[PDB]
Amino acid sequence: EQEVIMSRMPRSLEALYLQPLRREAEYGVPSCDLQLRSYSIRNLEFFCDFALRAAYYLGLPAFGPVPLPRMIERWTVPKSHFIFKKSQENFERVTLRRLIQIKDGHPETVQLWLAFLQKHAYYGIGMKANVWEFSKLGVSKAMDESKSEVEKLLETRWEHLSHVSDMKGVGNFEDFLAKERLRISGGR
Amino acid sequence: SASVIFSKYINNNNNKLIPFKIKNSDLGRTRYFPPISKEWKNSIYVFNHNNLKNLPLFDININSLIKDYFNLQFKDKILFKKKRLSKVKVVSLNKIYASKAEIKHTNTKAILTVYTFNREKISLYKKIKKLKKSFYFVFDKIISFSERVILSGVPVLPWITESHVNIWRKIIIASLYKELILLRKYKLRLDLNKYKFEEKLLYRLNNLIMKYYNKKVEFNIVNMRSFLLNSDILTKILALKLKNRNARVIKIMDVILNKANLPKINRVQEKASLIKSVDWNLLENKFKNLNLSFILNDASYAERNNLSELLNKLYYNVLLVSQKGVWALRSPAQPKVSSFAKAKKYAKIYQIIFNSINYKNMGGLRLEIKGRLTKRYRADRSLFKVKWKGGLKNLDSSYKGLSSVNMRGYAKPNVEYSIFTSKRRIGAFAVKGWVSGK
Amino acid sequence: FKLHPYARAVPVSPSYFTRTPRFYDNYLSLEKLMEEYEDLPVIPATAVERVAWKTLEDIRKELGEQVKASEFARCLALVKRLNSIHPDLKPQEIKDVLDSFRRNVQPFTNVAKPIPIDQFGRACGVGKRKASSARAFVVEGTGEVLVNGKTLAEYFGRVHDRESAVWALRATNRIDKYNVWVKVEGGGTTGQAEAITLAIAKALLAHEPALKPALRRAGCVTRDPRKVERKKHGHVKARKMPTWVKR
RNA sequence: GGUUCGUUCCAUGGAAUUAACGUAAACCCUUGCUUUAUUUGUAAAUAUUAUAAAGCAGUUCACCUUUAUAUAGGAAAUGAU
Ligand SMILES: [K+]
Ligand SMILES: [K+]
Ligand SMILES: [Mg+2]
Ligand SMILES: [Mg+2]
Ligand SMILES: [Mg+2]
């Protein structure tokens, strides 16, 4: 029952007060391009630092945030609903965006990174990721052999879905997805 | 070996090396960046704009649901209250007022913020609190006493079943019916007022709002201590007062302004500018070379090797009993918390947090009423009254000369504008209201 | 615990009814010190270390009073008089009151980074114009000039633009001392020509910094900020208005 | 009565002391510079175009002139910048 004088604090807590660390890419082949967008700059710059700290723990060498060109829309409208036309005013909607590109990233590890950002996404930010991956010839046979592998991973996930025996509200399965997807996206 | 397709992406390496340059210029403090949720009602971005075009319309529908949701009341038959029927429609000022909703959107959910001024709780809590302690003290005796004579022989047991408890309970109700229905009234009306902010009743409102956004909505209800701290709640209250025919317009505006308390100020110091001088306390100027390989390499202090020793000198550390001392731990169901979480003192952090927030104090107040507000039922002319107390200026920029961040390209970040439209028996009128913060 | 039976409100400062109580209280204190230490010797102003005294604005904000410029101007003549007292003979009382009138304001420092010279002896200068940006690599040579790979004559079909692009070398009479390899982008013929003028001038100063007084009078150091004005609603152009019909 | 782009500032009045709005300040684009970032932009690169976040900068210093001694102004391709 004695008191110990801690020489320092956990590195997880110290790293929160340093600039986000970055791994070094040995080859430099891009494995993911995450483009973040928002109408504000304060939440976009904050979440980009948070996204770089996650890429460090996963061993992903991230590059950026690269400031991409601003997307500026413009509208000139009359200030009066009725006749008065010699008086108009300009409006705009500037989209601020950043790019975080990961290189030499393992395909699965890159998907945990993306899965983490979506779970802890910051409000007011839209995200889009392009993932790359190398594969061998014979894609047809590769995707048929991996069926048994994916089935085992889903054994515990089928519980999410449940329907009455011989679901009749669906009808044509494929046509249901195609039409239900449009209804979810709002038209397309 | 490797693939050719792979080698064609290695050679494309013309990157610029991070130089770690040393700053030789003096840096000022960054502007005050106001929150993002206060620029647009919907803080959102989506790549498919089909989820973006109906938001202006939904804001109207959502605000209607929230307004009517907070006005829910028991039926007179549930509380046994005798309804006093009458033709006139009574205006209720002692309810929960709510402002327009601010929604933070993600691809997974939406956080709906709404500022409320709970005026009904102020009355119910004081009214029920008048019931003195003797009520509950004596009521306990009736329980014990009743068990000695009814559920026992004349002067937990295995010969007392629920079939007897029922009769034993009805006897108490029959003798205290006029008193229980009274306590039940205020107890239920107070709990209803309480559950409106809890998940007991909010999970139902979620099902109604969730149909507009197709995402689960999380509520962030902020209770305002004064109805003057939010413009939406202010113009709403002033509008309900003016809706009565016999309402004295000018008198009602004066009573509201009298309730508004402005802080003491020195006019000569507030309107005094600021001379731009390098602040050597800023972490940017104190260390012009931010690399630890230079800071921790015995630059100024003698053996401050530990990165923690450096951080403790810059920031306020709660883990330390002495602010610039040492972090001494103790070495040899219940909640899972550190053995020192109870000793942590967030006394100076509240100062750090709340001093870094601008526009806290109420700076100025402005009310405008315009429309048909005469008392007689004829075709008179429109009225227009204006009252104000304080100013709507952005003192940080107009006087001190600091740089501000205007909202939506033209609006001052310290003012709240809200308009509420109503109508008398003779025509329509509107109540505009501005509220600024210092 | 009970209040005192006899009590009356009294002003704290004797300058209660004055225009600026706090100022006069501090001004009268100086009048008292000066009248007390007037016999001490002084030093000629030439041997008095220059001090940055506060301004009329710093006092208004500090004292929270609306001090007058004329009344403060004479209060500033005392601190300058008392400051002239001999340091060794200056009393500690005057040393303290004088420290409250010093202005410790430091202006911000923003020094441009000097243009280096590559290991191969080529310095890069950058110039700009209406919409163009130039990068000139000036190296010791014979006088060969290239613009986007093309020669100076194959690129500019107007001799006026050629002379303006290398005007810095011409004005200083060094066309035959350096070889320029320019790379321009954006803008037009004259926009790019004037952009190279500033680019070569900056690169030239990296080799011979003592030519700036000459490039000044030549007009190759100044950056011309003129820019096309946007079109404005209600106008046919930046400033041209549509026909106004009186009737 | 002076002065200022300006109810700006100074002085003054046998009556003034203050508040709000406009004004001003600040904000957006643009100009020079500093730091950060380097892809989908950059010939190369020991990083200089471009891209875009934050910060600094002017009527600031020098020169000349200067009322009531209180508040200032002028000079404009041959002082600095
Ligand atoms: K034009
Ligand atoms: K740049
Ligand atoms: Mg006057
Ligand atoms: Mg203005
Ligand atoms: Mg590339």
Swiss-Prot record, chain A:
Location of this chain's protein in the cell: Mitochondrion
Per the record, what is one GO cellular component?
Answer: mitochondrion
GO terms (BP aspect): translation
User: Which UniProt keywords are given for this protein, alphabetically ordered?
Assistant: Mitochondrion, Ribonucleoprotein, Ribosomal protein, Transit peptide
Q: Which residues form a coiled coil?
A: none
Q: What is its main location?
A: mitochondrion
Record has Transit peptide as a keyword = yes
Q: ATP-binding: present as a keyword of the record?
A: no
The Gene Ontology terms for molecular function here are: structural constituent of ribosome
Described by its record, this protein's role is as follows:
Component of the mitochondrial ribosome (mitoribosome), a dedicated translation machinery responsible for the synthesis of mitochondrial genome-encoded proteins, including at least some of the essential transmembrane subunits of the mitochondrial respiratory chain. The mitoribosomes are attached to the mitochondrial inner membrane and translation products are cotranslationally integrated into the membrane.
Q: Which family does it belong to?
A: Belongs to the universal ribosomal protein uS10 family.
What does the subunit section of this Swiss-Prot or TrEMBL entry state?
A: Component of the mitochondrial small ribosomal subunit (mt-SSU). Mature N.crassa 74S mitochondrial ribosomes consist of a small (37S) and a large (54S) subunit. The 37S small subunit contains a 16S ribosomal RNA (16S mt-rRNA) and 32 different proteins. The 54S large subunit contains a 23S rRNA (23S mt-rRNA) and 42 different proteins.
Name-wise, this protein is: Small ribosomal subunit protein uS10m
The uppermost taxa in this organism's lineage are: Eukaryota, Fungi, Dikarya, Ascomycota, Pezizomycotina
The gene designation is mrp-10
According to the record, which residues of the full protein are present here?
81 to 268 of 268
From Swiss-Prot, chain B:
Identify the keywords attached in UniProt to this record, alphabetized: Mitochondrion, Ribonucleoprotein, Ribosomal protein
Q: Which GO terms describe its cellular component?
A: mitochondrion; ribonucleoprotein complex; ribosome
Positions in coiled-coil regions = none
Q: Does the keyword Thylakoid apply?
A: no
Tell me which domain of life the UniProt entry assigns to the organism this sequence originates from: Eukaryota
- State where the protein is found: Mitochondrion
Major subcellular location class: mitochondrion
Subunit details: Component of the mitochondrial small ribosomal subunit (mt-SSU). Mature N.crassa 74S mitochondrial ribosomes consist of a small (37S) and a large (54S) subunit. The 37S small subunit contains a 16S ribosomal RNA (16S mt-rRNA) and 32 different proteins. The 54S large subunit contains a 23S rRNA (23S mt-rRNA) and 42 different proteins. uS3m, uS4m and uS5m form the narrow entry site of the mRNA channel.
Functional summary from the UniProt entry: Component of the mitochondrial ribosome (mitoribosome), a dedicated translation machinery responsible for the synthesis of mitochondrial genome-encoded proteins, including at least some of the essential transmembrane subunits of the mitochondrial respiratory chain. The mitoribosomes are attached to the mitochondrial inner membrane and translation products are cotranslationally integrated into the membrane. uS3m is essential for mitochondrial protein synthesis and required for the maturation of small ribosomal subunits.
For this chain, the family text in UniProt reads: Belongs to the universal ribosomal protein uS3 family.
Name of the protein described by the UniProt record: Small ribosomal subunit protein uS3m
Q: What's the source species for this entry?
A: Neurospora crassa (strain ATCC 24698 / 74-OR23-1A / CBS 708.71 / DSM 1257 / FGSC 987)
Question: What broad taxonomic lineage does this protein's source fall under?
Answer: Eukaryota, Fungi, Dikarya, Ascomycota, Pezizomycotina
UniProtKB/Swiss-Prot annotation, chain C:
Could you cite one Gene Ontology molecular function of this protein? RNA binding
- Any one biological process term the GO annotation gives: translation
Q: Which family does it belong to?
A: Belongs to the universal ribosomal protein uS9 family.
Where is this protein localized, as stated in its record? Mitochondrion
Chief location of this protein within or outside the cell: mitochondrion
- Subunit and interaction comment: Component of the mitochondrial small ribosomal subunit (mt-SSU). Mature N.crassa 74S mitochondrial ribosomes consist of a small (37S) and a large (54S) subunit. The 37S small subunit contains a 16S ribosomal RNA (16S mt-rRNA) and 32 different proteins. The 54S large subunit contains a 23S rRNA (23S mt-rRNA) and 42 different proteins.
Q: Where is this region: Disordered?
A: 225-247
Q: What is this protein called?
A: Small ribosomal subunit protein uS9m
UniProt feature, compositional bias: Basic residues: 228-247
Instruction: Please tell me one Gene Ontology term that the record gives under cellular component.
Output: mitochondrial small ribosomal subunit
Q: What is the originating organism of this protein?
A: Neurospora crassa (strain ATCC 24698 / 74-OR23-1A / CBS 708.71 / DSM 1257 / FGSC 987)
Its biological purpose: Component of the mitochondrial ribosome (mitoribosome), a dedicated translation machinery responsible for the synthesis of mitochondrial genome-encoded proteins, including at least some of the essential transmembrane subunits of the mitochondrial respiratory chain. The mitoribosomes are attached to the mitochondrial inner membrane and translation products are cotranslationally integrated into the membrane.
Q: Which UniProt keywords apply?
A: Mitochondrion, Ribonucleoprotein, Ribosomal protein, Transit peptide
